[PDB]
């Protein structure tokens, strides 16, 4: 479905050539990412304005998202923010899952939004922007392509859209809306979740503290191997957390190995205690893995 152009001799300057090259370029970049990572997509940033929740309105302030088909959204560098989401029609619910949606590409054309009405949502918008040339001095207007982004509810029909979680809202004791204190979207960059950063920092601290106690102290076989497990794991876990801008898959593997070894010392639990990695629902991966590690280290 991607027709790479043939730029030879008397080529014709057709708009299709440019569109097809762009499609390939994205595909190629995506193919490369997939060589090392199972899930090269997810959230990088998802900052929202909390001051509108008291007035039943949700408005993103900064979104950086990579979709399952290599599409890259960046409202800091190239994209516009989505329209304000009216929660009035969702009022009946006590819990709301909000996702970022982008309409699917239409292979049969009609992708550009020309203001007309259609049964299938348009995904592209045309904006006129005055853009400065880099090489020379001349300044002029061009047609800039923007994504037709919007916020939708998880419980709504989303057949025509690509989408991923960005935030969850719950009702507080006073009945007002508040972002769920412990929500994690599918992450692309580890640092995308501030709460995860905090928990990981605590883990590293406790790991090091236990290490130092056992290290100073050095039945003696268990001591040596428990210590070994910590001495081996700490140097790498530290590096992973010191510069926390990597895909979660790398961290998961390292943490999983540590949990594995520690379960060799404990008889109070199972051996399949370590959860499988799930990209879409990281909430069931990291929070329990980290809890397991903390408990095992404490048990020592």
């Amino acid at each position: 479905k991607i027709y790479r152009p043939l730029w030879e001799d008397g080529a014709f300057l057709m708009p299709q050539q440019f569109q097809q090259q762009a499609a390939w370029d994205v595909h190629l970049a995506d193919s490369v990412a997939r060589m090392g990572l199972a899930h090269p997509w997810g959230v990088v940033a998802a900052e929202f304005d909390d001051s509108l929740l008291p007035l039943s309105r949700l408005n993103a302030t900064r979104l950086i998202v990579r979709f399952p088909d290599g599409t890259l959204i960046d409202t800091e560098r190239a994209d516009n923010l989505p329209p304000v989401c009216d929660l009035s029609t969702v009022s009946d619910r006590s819990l709301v899952d909000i996702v970022l949606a982008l309409p699917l590409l239409n292979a049969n054309g009609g992708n550009l939004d020309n203001g007309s009405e259609s049964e299938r949502p348009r995904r592209w918008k045309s904006e006129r922007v005055n853009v400065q040339e880099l090489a020379g001095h001349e300044q002029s207007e061009v047609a800039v392509l923007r994504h037709n982004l919007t916020l939708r509810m998880a419980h709504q029909e989303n057949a025509a859209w690509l989408t991923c979680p960005v935030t969850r809202l719950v009702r507080d004791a006073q009945g007002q809306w508040c972002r769920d204190p412990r929500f994690i979207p599918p992450l692309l960059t580890l640092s995308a979740s501030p709460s995860l950063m905090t928990e990981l920092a605590e883990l590293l601290h406790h790991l090091q503290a236990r290490r130092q106690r056992l290290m100073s102290m050095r039945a003696d076989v268990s001591l040596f191997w428990l210590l070994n497990a910590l001495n081996s794991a700490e140097p790498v876990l530290k590096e992973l957390l010191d510069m926390p801008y990597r895909h979660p898959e790398l961290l998961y593997r390292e943490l999983a190995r540590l949990a594995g070894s520690l379960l060799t010392f404990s008889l109070e639990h199972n051996v399949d205690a370590v959860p499988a990695y799930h990209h879409e629902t990281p909430e069931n991966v990291f929070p329990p893995l980290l809890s397991l590690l903390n408990r095992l280290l404490e048990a020592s």
């Binding site: 080529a11 300057l13 299709q16």
Partner: protein, 76 residues
């Protein structure tokens, strides 16, 4: 000698009747022309000649009167 030539139409992208590279197209504002003009540079050693060559002078007028026939419509 280089001159800039305005274009009748800008270079655009089309589907039904696209531009072939055989036409050696350029961006839509101006094209160059290096086959339409020559440069004739003069230099004098006295004020008398200069005044004659300046616009309004008799040498300026006479030179154009001669070019009218000698070059005619061939080149500017």
């Amino acid at each position: 000698d280089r001159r800039r030539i305005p274009l009748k139409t800008p270079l655009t992208m089309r589907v039904h009747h696209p531009v072939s590279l055989k036409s050696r197209p350029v961006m839509g504002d101006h094209a160059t022309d290096v086959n339409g003009q020559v440069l004739l540079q003069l230099s004098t050693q006295t004020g008398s000649e200069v005044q004659g060559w300046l616009p309004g002078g008799h040498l300026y007028s006479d030179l154009l009167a001669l070019l009218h026939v000698y070059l005619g419509s061939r080149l500017d």
